[PDB]
Design a protein around this ligand. Structure first.
Ligand SMILES: *[C@@H]1O[C@H](CO)[C@@H](O[C@@H]2O[C@H](CO)[C@@H](O)[C@H](O)[C@H]2NC(C)=O)[C@H](O)[C@H]1NC(C)=O
Ligand SMILES: *[C@@H]1O[C@H](CO)[C@@H](O)[C@H](O)[C@H]1NC(C)=O
Ligand SMILES: *[C@@H]1O[C@H](CO)[C@@H](O)[C@H](O)[C@H]1NC(C)=O
Lengths: 321, 148
């Protein structure tokens, strides 16, 4: 006629950790991490990211010809570039304030490409057709970025150059140009005729003068010269001017745009889907009311705090046998 | 006690009794109640406490320690738990063991073998915290002494 005492041994197998014993199996626990994700890259709240496959942001924005087809949009949630996207500055050189630009462009609401200095109209006294390199081949022939023009002496004279644009668009206008530093004085002279050549660029938000550096850098894509790439945001009301006695690689296409509070740039070989989520990761997305995750240091939108720990498992209840 | 119960149902812990009536399982209420009332309470206060400063190495040095600081918070409240319930099992056992005393044999293993005849409302009586040692005293002493 007994009465005894005992406890629960659960069907549930998840193990947690203690001081004196690590491996230990329990009946109940909670996990504060999230290992799991949909293994996809989604539209973040109904907006699709932008995906540049073989191009990185520079070649894309510069209009590298390998980026010719790619995609477009007025809008994107974030930006994704692959591990394999190598199409950058095909003429060797430094992109300036690159990181900052990358951040401005992570999220965009309206993005409008317009040709800020028409190739036909804008440069009557300089030569707009010579501007190609083998450094930038397209279709088996010498080529250049689509969004810039490499301007060159017409003549045997390279006159002084000033063109101005007022921003009549409704938004910020991203404008990009570059500076050509040729390899030798002879090189300098062929292109711009003028050894004394300088370049100046200005606005309400921006003022800089440029002197090119003639020198022989190591051959890259066969170039011993260099090209620095610069940019700025011209305010809606604002005006921007350009002066050069040489060495200036002029804007052709610019972009009217309005930002969004930055998302990131995700670098992943993960594929996009028509799916959607709140929280995007390089590896995938996550639906969690969960506090953390070990998944990736890089998260987008509203996301669980990243953590480098393997497993966080508490205990709701006792051991089992 | 040397094992758990696959057959337990309503809760974490309780008793299993075979009387002249029948057998089977059951568990307690308040003991399981105020258990989680205290547990989920603790589960909160830990994680809640972590946060950050404003008490009035980029993140690379901070993070690694934040974790190391956090990881242990679990290795504690975890440890402080498997001991917590264990304590509540003991407490369950002893609250009966003092109640019954001479009346039942402690064979251990959470198990008691009643010297007298216990059937329901005596059982639940024990459970209610109200059990009569006098009621069953002789019914016990007789049966117990035949043994010795
Ligand atoms: C676009 O990217 C591809 C690969 O990222 C470039 O092609 C490589 O060019 C380099 C030197 O020009 C060579 O080492 C490789 O053998 C080439 N591979 C391929 C696929 O052709 C291509 O030149 C890039 N185009 C531009 C203008 O940047
Ligand atoms: C995902 O898609 C719907 C409808 O396409 C969109 O309107 C919504 O904002 C998204 N869901 C979220 C944010 O939970
Ligand atoms: C995951 O997110 C979607 C968003 O619409 C929702 O419908 C679904 O119930 C969520 N699942 C969980 C586990 O919360």
């Amino acid at each position: 006629d007994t009465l005894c005492i005992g406890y629960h041994a659960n069907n549930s197998t998840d193990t947690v950790d203690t001081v004196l014993e690590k491996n230990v199996t329990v009946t109940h626990s909670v996990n504060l991490l999230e290992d799991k994700h949909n293994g996809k890259l989604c539209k973040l709240r109904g907006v699709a990211p932008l995906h540049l496959g073989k191009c990185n942001i520079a070649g894309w924005i510069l209009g590298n010809p390998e980026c010719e087809s790619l995609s477009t949009a007025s809008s994107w949630s974030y930006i994704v570039e692959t591990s394999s996207s190598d199409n950058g500055t095909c003429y060797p050189g430094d992109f300036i304030d690159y990181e900052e630009l990358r951040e401005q462009l992570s999220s965009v609401s309206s993005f409008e490409r317009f040709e800020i200095f028409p190739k036909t109209s804008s440069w009557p006294n300089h030569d707009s057709n010579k501007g190609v390199t083998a450094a930038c081949p397209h279709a088996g022939a010498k080529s250049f970025y689509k969004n810039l023009i490499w301007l060159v002496k017409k003549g045997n004279s390279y006159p002084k150059l000033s063109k101005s644009y007022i921003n009549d668009k409704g938004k910020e206008v991203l404008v990009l140009w570059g500076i050509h530093h040729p390899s030798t004085s002879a090189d300098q002279q062929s292109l711009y005729q003028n050894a004394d050549a300088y370049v100046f660029v200005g606005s309400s938000r921006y003022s800089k003068k440029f002197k090119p550096e003639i020198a022989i850098r190591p051959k890259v894509r066969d170039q011993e010269g260099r090209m620095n790439y610069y940019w700025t945001l011209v305010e809606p009301g604002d005006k921007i001017t350009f002066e050069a006695t040489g060495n200036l690689v002029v804007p052709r296409y610019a972009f009217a745009m309005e930002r969004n509070a930055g998302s990131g740039i995700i670098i992943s070989d993960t594929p996009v889907h028509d799916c959607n989520t709140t929280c995007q990761t390089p590896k995938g997305a996550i639906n969690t009311s969960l506090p953390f995750q070990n998944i990736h240091p890089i998260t987008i939108g509203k996301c669980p705090k990243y953590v480098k720990s393997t497993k966080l498992r508490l205990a709701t209840g006792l051991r089992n046998v | 006690i040397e094992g758990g119960w696959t057959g337990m149902v309503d809760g974490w812990y309780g008793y299993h009794h075979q009387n002249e009536q029948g057998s089977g399982y059951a568990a307690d209420l308040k003991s399981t109640q105020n258990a989680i009332d205290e547990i989920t309470n603790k589960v909160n206060s830990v994680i809640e406490k972590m946060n950050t400063q404003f008490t009035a190495k980029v993140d690379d040095g901070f993070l690694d320690i934040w974790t190391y600081n956090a990881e242990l918070l679990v290795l504690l409240e975890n440890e402080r738990t498997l001991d917590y319930h264990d304590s509540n099992v003991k407490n369950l056992y002893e609250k009966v063991r003092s109640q019954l005393k001479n009346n039942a044999k402690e064979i251990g293993n959470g198990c008691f073998e009643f010297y007298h005849k216990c059937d329901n409302t005596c059982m639940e009586s024990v459970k209610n915290g109200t059990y009569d040692y006098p009621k069953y005293s002789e019914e016990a002493k007789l049966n117990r002494e035949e043994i010795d």
